[PDB]
Swiss-Prot record, chain A:
InterPro entries associated with the record: Nucleotide-bd_a/b_plait_sf (IPR012677), Ribosomal_eS24 (IPR001976), Ribosomal_eS24_CS (IPR018098), Ribosomal_uL23/eL15/eS24_sf (IPR012678)
Coiled coil feature spans: none
Subunit (UniProt): May be present in 2 copies per 70S ribosome. Part of the 30S ribosomal subunit, where it binds 16S rRNA at its canonical site at the bse of the body, as well as a possible second 50S binding site near 23S rRNA helix 45.
Native source organism of the sequence: Pyrococcus furiosus (strain ATCC 43587 / DSM 3638 / JCM 8422 / Vc1)
Keyword Ribonucleoprotein: yes
Biological processes, Gene Ontology terms: translation
Protein name: Small ribosomal subunit protein eS24
Keywords annotated in UniProt: Ribonucleoprotein, Ribosomal protein, RNA-binding, rRNA-binding
Curated annotation (Swiss-Prot), chain B:
Xref: Gene3D superfamilies: 3.100.10.10
Organism listed in the record: Pyrococcus furiosus (strain ATCC 43587 / DSM 3638 / JCM 8422 / Vc1)
UniProt record, GO biological process: translation
Gene from which this protein is expressed: rpl18e
Assembly with partners or alone: Part of the 50S ribosomal subunit.
UniProt entry tagged with the keyword Ribonucleoprotein: yes
Entry superkingdom: Archaea
Name used for this protein in its record: Large ribosomal subunit protein eL18
Keywords annotated in UniProt: Ribonucleoprotein, Ribosomal protein
SUPFAM superfamilies in UniProt: Ribosomal proteins L15p and L18e
From Swiss-Prot, chain C:
Keyword Cell wall biogenesis/degradation among record annotations: no
Protein name as it appears in the record: Large ribosomal subunit protein eL32
Subunit-structure text: Part of the 50S ribosomal subunit.
GO terms for biological process, alphabetical: translation
Classification via Pfam families: Ribosomal_L32e
Cited InterPro entries: Ribosomal_eL32, Ribosomal_eL32_arc, Ribosomal_eL32_CS, Ribosomal_eL32_sf
GO cellular component: cytosolic large ribosomal subunit
PROSITE patterns, A to Z: RIBOSOMAL_L32E
A GO molecular-function annotation: structural constituent of ribosome
Protein family per UniProt: Belongs to the eukaryotic ribosomal protein eL32 family.
Curated annotation (Swiss-Prot), chain D:
Protein name (database record): Large ribosomal subunit protein uL15
Organism annotation: Pyrococcus furiosus (strain ATCC 43587 / DSM 3638 / JCM 8422 / Vc1)
GO molecular function terms noted in the UniProt entry: rRNA binding; structural constituent of ribosome
Underlying gene: rpl15
Keyword hit for Ribonucleoprotein: yes
Described purpose of this protein according to its UniProt entry: Binds to the 23S rRNA.
Length: 92, 120, 128, 147
RNA sequence: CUAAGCCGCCCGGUGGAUGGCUCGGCUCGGGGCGCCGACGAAGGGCGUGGCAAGCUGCGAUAAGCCCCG
RNA sequence: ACCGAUAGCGAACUAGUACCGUGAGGGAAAGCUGAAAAGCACCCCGGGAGGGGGGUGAAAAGAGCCUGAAACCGGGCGGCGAUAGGAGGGUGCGGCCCGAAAGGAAUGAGCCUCCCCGAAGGAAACCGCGGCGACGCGGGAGUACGAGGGGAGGGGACCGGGGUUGCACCGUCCGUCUUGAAACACGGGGCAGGGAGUUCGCGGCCGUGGCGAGGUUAAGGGGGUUAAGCCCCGUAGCCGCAGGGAAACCGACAUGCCCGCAGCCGGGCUUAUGCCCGGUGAGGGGCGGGGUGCGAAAGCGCCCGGAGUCACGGCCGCGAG
RNA sequence: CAAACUCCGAACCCACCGCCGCCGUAGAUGGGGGGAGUAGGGUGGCGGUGUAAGCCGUCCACCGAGAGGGGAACAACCCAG
RNA sequence: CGGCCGCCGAGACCCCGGCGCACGGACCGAUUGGUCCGUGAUCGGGUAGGCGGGCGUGCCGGUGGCGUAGAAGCCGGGCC
C-alpha cells in the first residue's frame, strides 16, 4: 500500500523526487527491493536510473515514510548520487 | 550501563550492510565482522603491521574489525581491509606492496569472503 | 483487515469502559488533592493500596494497555492530527486521518482551514 | 558523544536516594573516621581493609639519594634503532659515510640495550653498551664504536 | 411544597495565588578611575519651600546666588 | 544559556526606614486603573457612611482600581434528609436530576424478532440395570446450552458520560522507627507559595569520539570581530614506549613449541537450516627461553613477543559546610 | 545406672566415581570490572539451660519483603504465590 | 465414633481475546532505536537496593508556527 504524497521535478539536476508513505498494518517494514519494484511498476520509472534515498519507520506507527529519486540518466546518477548509495542500491 | 553501540552513522550502515550481505550470500564471515565491529568502543580491536606480517602469507586477504596501526615492519604483499588505517600503517602496507582498502571495497571484490582471515 | 480493525476497536472500547480512574490514595479527603486529581504510587510501609488489599482502589499496570493496532486512535477510528494552518491541513490523508484545529487558531484562519478541508474531503473533529 | 541525565533526576521521588535506612549517611560516624582515620595505627576500624588492599601504608622503608646527585642514563634499543633509522636519517642522527652506514646515538642516548633484532649492518657510536647488544651487532656484522 | 445537617454546580463576599510586565538586584573577560583633612575632613545635630509632613537637595544668600560655553 | 516581587542585595517603594533592647547591637512589611481622568454631571432615599437611577469608557478596569486561583462564608438549584453503626472508600446495578459543543449516532441509538458458526465446559424428560439408602451406571449425548465471532428484518432518538443517593458484599486513615501499627507509640485544623545529593581537587570504572608508538597541550602570542564568540601558532610540562632493586647498579621473545574458540578450506548426511569428521587457526590458554632482587647454587618474587594518550558525558570513593 | 563410659551400633549425613534426570553454544561451570543494601530479626520443629515464661544456638519452611480464598476476628496455621 | 452419597466453594487449574518482558530471526532508521514474525509447563508479588524507558517545568542555539477575527493564566466539561 503506497500513497505518493509529493512528486517534484528538478531540471537543474534532472531528477524526479518522490515522497510517499507505505501503509503496512500488521506487517514488517517492506524491503528496499520490494518498495523499488512496486514504485517502478506503478509510476513507470526506469529501474536502472532510480534509487531509494531512505525508508523510515516511526515508533508504533504502521505508516513508513519513504523518499526516492529517479534521475534522467545514468550519467546524472553517477555524477550526483554517491558511491555508498550506489552499492546499497546495486545499480553499479 | 547499557551499550549504545557505535555513534557513527556510517559504521552503523556498514554493520547493517554486512548483516544483509551475509544473509544474501549464506556466509558467516560478514555477520562475525558485524558483531566484532559492534563490540564496545573501549574494547575495539587494534592490530599492528607487525602482527599482520607475522601471521599473514603473500597475497592473502585480511580483515580487521577495527583500527590498523603502523608499529613494526611489514614484508608481505597482503590486501588489508579495516575500518581505520593509520597514515604510517597505510604507507607501510603500500610500500610492502599490498592494498589498504575499506570493508565495503573488500565485500565488493570478494562477496563470498572465501579465504579471508579475520585479525584482531 | 477491516474486520479485525473493527473487532479491536470494540475490544478497546470495552476495556476502556471497564478501566477505572487511577487516583492518588486519600484523594477525596483533602481539597489539596481533590482539586488536583492525579495518581501517585503509594510507598508507605503500612499503605493498604501499596499492599493491594481488596476493598481498596487499584493501581495502574501494563495489562491495561490498549491493543497495539488501535492504540491512540480517535473513537471514530481515525488518527488525529493537530493542524495550525492550511499548509498543515493539506498534508493529511483524507482516507485514514482526521484534522483537529489547534485551540489557539483564530476565526479568520479557521474559516479558511474549514473551507479547504471541506473542498479536500478531510474530516474535521472540531468544526468551529 | 553520549550524554545522560544524572541519577538524582531518577531518584527525585525515592525518599532515600539509595542510601538504605534513614539513619545512615550522617557524618564521620557513618564513615567510621574522617579521611584515612582507622587505618590501623591507633584505631583499627579499617584494619581489615588496610591489611588487604593497602599494604605498606604504615611503616618505613629504605632511603633515597638526593636528586642533586642523581644522574639519568638514557637508554635505547637495537629494535628501536632498526625501526626508526629513517627518522634518524631525516633528523641527521645517522648518515652514510662512504660505504658503511653510521649512527651517532650520542645525541639522544647514553647506553644501548640489547632488546630485539638488528638485521642490516650498521655502525653505532655510543658511550655505554650491553653484552647482548654487542653479541647481536657482531653477529649481524655491524660495529659498535665505544665513544 | 420536612427543620437542622451532608455532597455537587452557579452566583456574591473574603482573600491575594497564578499569568503578563520591570527605572531594581546578582555575576562577569575587557576598558576607565582611584585617596579627603588645621586653607578645618568623613560622620552627625539643627534649620531651609506660599500652601511642606517624609525622602532628596541646599545652609540665615538656605529644593538656592554669580560668570564663560 | 543568572532572578522576575515569599525570587533577586536586607532594601525595585519617604530602607538600614518604621520598630526592639539601658547598652553593645538587632531589624521588617510594602510594585501594577485606564489609550486618554474622560476619576461619575443631575434626580430619589439616608443624620452620615452609603444605596438606587442616570452618565464616561472598546472593556468598570471605580481609585477598597490588570487577571482574581485555593481555603472559608452567604444565597439559589439537583440529590438525600428525624428506627440507624463504622477510617467516610471499593465492585455492580437501581431511583431522582443534568446532558448544545468537544464522544458515538437519522449513512441509524437504546430496544424487538429471526438465522449460522463456536473453545474450555456441559444438563434433563424417558427407557434398562446395580445398591438397604442417599444415589449411581449404559442410551438419550458430547444433545439443549455455552465466552465470543457473523448475517437479516422491524422501530425511529437515544447511548456513552456526569451529580447525589439506595441496596448486597467487602474495607480498622496517611507518613515513620520497629520482629511486630488501627493502636492507649511519634509527626498529622484547612489552603496557597517556598523547601533538601550542589561546586571544586585527586583517584577507580564504564558509554562514545579523535589520533596512534605516540598522545595532548598549560601560561601566553598573532589574525579577525560590536563582542570574551571564530582561525592559527605555542613541546614548557604530563602520561606511554623497560623492568628489577632500599641503594650502588644492572638491563629482557619484533614468536622456539603445544592446546585451541570464532572465521576460512575439504569431505559425509540432511529438502533447506543444521549436524559430524579432518586441516589452518587472529584473539585466548599453557610450556620453553630471557632481565633483575635474594642466594654458594638450585630455586622463587616482579617483569619481558608494542597500546597508549586526549576529550565529552555518567556512577562511585576521599577532603572541603 | 552414666552429657564429660563403650565389647557393639542404626536411621542419617558427607567425600569421590558411573549412570538416569535436569541445565548449557539463544553461551552454563568459571573469570574480570561498576554499584549497593545488610551487623536489632520474628513464628515454627530440634538441642543446651530455666519451676515456667524466657535466654542462647540450630533447621530455611512462613511473616519480615506477600495479594486472593478460610480458621469469628489473627504475622506465623490450611489452600494458594 | 466407624463409613458412604450428592452438592456448594478462590486471582489456584483449563479455554478464548489483549498488554508487556526475556531470548532468537527478517526488514528498515544519518546518536541509544523502529515494524513484523517464532518460543516461553520450564516469563509477569515485592521492602532495602541495582538497571532500562518515558511524562512535566525555566532559559539558550536552530527549525516549523500560532495570536486583538483574541496569547498566557483561571473555572466547569469531552476525548486520548
Amino acid at each position: 500500500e503506497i500513497r505518493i504524497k509529493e512528486i517534484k521535478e528538478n531540471k537543474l539536476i534532472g531528477r524526479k523526487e518522490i515522497y510517499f508513505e507505505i501503509y503496512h498494518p500488521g506487517e514488517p517494514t517492506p524491503s528496499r527491493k520490494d518498495v523499488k519494484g512496486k514504485l517502478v511498476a506503478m509510476l513507470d520509472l526506469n529501474p536502472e536510473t532510480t534509487v531509494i534515498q531512505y525508508i523510515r519507520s516511526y515508533f508504533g506507527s504502521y505508516i513508513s515514510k519513504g523518499y526516492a529519486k529517479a534521475y534522467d540518466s545514468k550519467e546524472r546518477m553517477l555524477y550526483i548520487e554517491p558511491e555508498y548509495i550506489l552499492i546499497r542500491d546495486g545499480l553499479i | 550501563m547499557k551499550r549504545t553501540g557505535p555513534t557513527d552513522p556510517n559504521l552503523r550502515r556498514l554493520i547493517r550492510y554486512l548483516r544483509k550481505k551475509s544473509n544474501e550470500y549464506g556466509v558467516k564471515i560478514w555477520k562475525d565482522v558485524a558483531w566484532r565491529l559492534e563490540r564496545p568502543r573501549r574494547q575495539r580491536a587494534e592490530v599492528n603491521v607487525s602482527k599482520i606480517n607475522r601471521y599473514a602469507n603473500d597475497g592473502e586477504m585480511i580483515v580487521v574489525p577495527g583500527s590498523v596501526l603502523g608499529a613494526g615492519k611489514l614484508e608481505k604483499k597482503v590486501i588489508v581491509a579495516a575500518w581505520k588505517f593509520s597514515e604510517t600503517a597505510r604507507r607501510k602496507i603500500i610500500e610492502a606492496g599490498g592494498e589498504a582498502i575499506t570493508i565495503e571495497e573488500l565485500i565488493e571484490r570478494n562477496p563470498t569472503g572465501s579465504g579471508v582471515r579475520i585479525m584482531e | 483487515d477491516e474486520k479485525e480493525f473493527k473487532r479491536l476497536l470494540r475490544v478497546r472500547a470495552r476495556l476502556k469502559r471497564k478501566k477505572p480512574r487511577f487516583l492518588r490514595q486519600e484523594w477525596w479527603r483533602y481539597p489539596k488533592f481533590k482539586n488536583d486529581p492525579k495518581w501517585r504510587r503509594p510507598k508507605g510501609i503500612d499503605s493498604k493500596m501499596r499492599l493491594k488489599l481488596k476493598g481498596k482502589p487499584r493501581s495502574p499496570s501494563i495489562g491495561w494497555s490498549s491493543p497495539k493496532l488501535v492504540r491512540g486512535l480517535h473513537p471514530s477510528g481515525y488518527e488525529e492530527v493537530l493542524v495550525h494552518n492550511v499548509k498543515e491541513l493539506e498534508a493529511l490523508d483524507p482516507k485514514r486521518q482526521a484534522a483537529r484545529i489547534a485551540h489557539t487558531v483564530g476565526k479568520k484562519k479557521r474559516i479558511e482551514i474549514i473551507k479547504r478541508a471541506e473542498e479536500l474531503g478531510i474530516k474535521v473533529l472540531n468544526p468551529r | 558523544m553520549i550524554r545522560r541525565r544524572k541519577k538524582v533526576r531518577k531518584l527525585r521521588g525515592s525518599h532515600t536516594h539509595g542510601w538504605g535506612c534513614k539513619k545512615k549517611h550522617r557524618g564521620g560516624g557513618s564513615k567510621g573516621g574522617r579521611g584515612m582515620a582507622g587505618t590501623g595505627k591507633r584505631n583499627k576500624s579499617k584494619w581489615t581493609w588496610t591489611i588487604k588492599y593497602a599494604p605498606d601504608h604504615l611503616g618505613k622503608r629504605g632511603f633515597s639519594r638526593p636528586p642533586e646527585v642523581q644522574r639519568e642514563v638514557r637508554v635505547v634499543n637495537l629494535k628501536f634503532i632498526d625501526e626508526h633509522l629513517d627518522e634518524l636519517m631525516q633528523m641527521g642522527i645517522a648518515y652514510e659515510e662512504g660505504g658503511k652506514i653510521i649512527v651517532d646515538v650520542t645525541q639522544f642516548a647514553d647506553k644501548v640495550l640489547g632488546t630485539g633484532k638488528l638485521t642490516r649492518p650498521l655502525v653505532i657510536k655510543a658511550r655505554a653498551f650491553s653484552p647482548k647488544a654487542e653479541e647481536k651487532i657482531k653477529a649481524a656484522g655491524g660495529e659498535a664504536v665505544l665513544v
